[PDB]
Amino acid sequence: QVQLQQPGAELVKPGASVKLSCKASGYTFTSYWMHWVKQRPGRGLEWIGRIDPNSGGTKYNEKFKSKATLTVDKPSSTAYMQLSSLTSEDSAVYYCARYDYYGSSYFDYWGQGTTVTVSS
Amino acid sequence: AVVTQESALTTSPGETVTLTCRSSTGAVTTSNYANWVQEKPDHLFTGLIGGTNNRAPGVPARFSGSLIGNKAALTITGAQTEDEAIYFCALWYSNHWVFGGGTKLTVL
């Protein structure tokens, strides 16, 4: 019933931008935080940032501040991440994930991830 | 901060195994809200433990988090082949989260 939905992929050109979306259902969108995470081959996870959907307030990984922009659309219950001036370092899988910030403090439900591929 | 986990562990069905999560800057405390996440073949992630020892609903009994010494740890009792996956831990440092490198667990 809890579901985070993300599109499967983006094939984009160096230096363009993309807007990544993550649609939540089966729960009260404003009662949990939403995080974005990067997974590059043979590595793990890099935390991008978080957004409080109820206040639209954001916290970013200093590494990603001049790169990513987190927003929501409360009525459509969708979280977005925009990525600017995409380079080779930007090819990876990007996940949205729910954090029970007021409950038991777990990243319990995860989207399936959108694979971003930069190529000319 | 750097979070380090064993790169790989190998166990056998029915055996007990413990994986750990260590911090660069000192001992890991509840204030770090240690999380354990499971990644299964093709990029399927499930949260398993949060706030150092809270099992997520649906997660079998055989898994449990705790602090052992200066590190966060996840123990699996009577490991099944099903449990074969990559386990990540995440630690919280006041203005951000940091993930460990992951432990690939092989179940012979």
- Documented resolution in Å: 2.1
Contact A47 B99 (CB under 8 A): yes
The chain B residues in contact with chain A (CB within 8 A) are: 33, 35, 37, 43-51, 54, 56, 86, 88, 90, 95-102
B72 CA to chain A: closest CA distance, Å?
A: 15
Cα–Cα dist A37/A32, whole Å: 16
Residue in B35, B44, B97 nearest the CB of A106: B35
How many structural domains compose chain A? 1
- CB < 8 Å & 24+ apart, contacts of A40-44: A40/A91, A40/A92, A41/A92, A43/B101, A44/B86, A44/B88, A44/B99, A44/B100, A44/B101, A44/B102
Residue B2 near residue B90 (C-beta atoms within 8 A)? no
Q: Which residues of A touch B32 (CB under 8 A)?
A: none
Cα–Cα dist A22/B20, whole Å: 31
Contact B101 A47 (CB under 8 A): no
CATH number at residue A46: 2.60.40.10
Superfamily of domain B1-108: Immunoglobulins (2.60.40.10)
A1 part of contact set with chain B, CB < 8 Å: no
Residue B99 near residue B86 (C-beta atoms within 8 A)? no
Cα–Cα dist B22/A108, whole Å: 22
Domain that holds residue A30: 1-120
- Technique behind the model: X-ray
Work out the angle at residue A110's Cα, subtended by the Cα atoms of residues A105 and A115, and round it to the nearest 5 degrees.
140
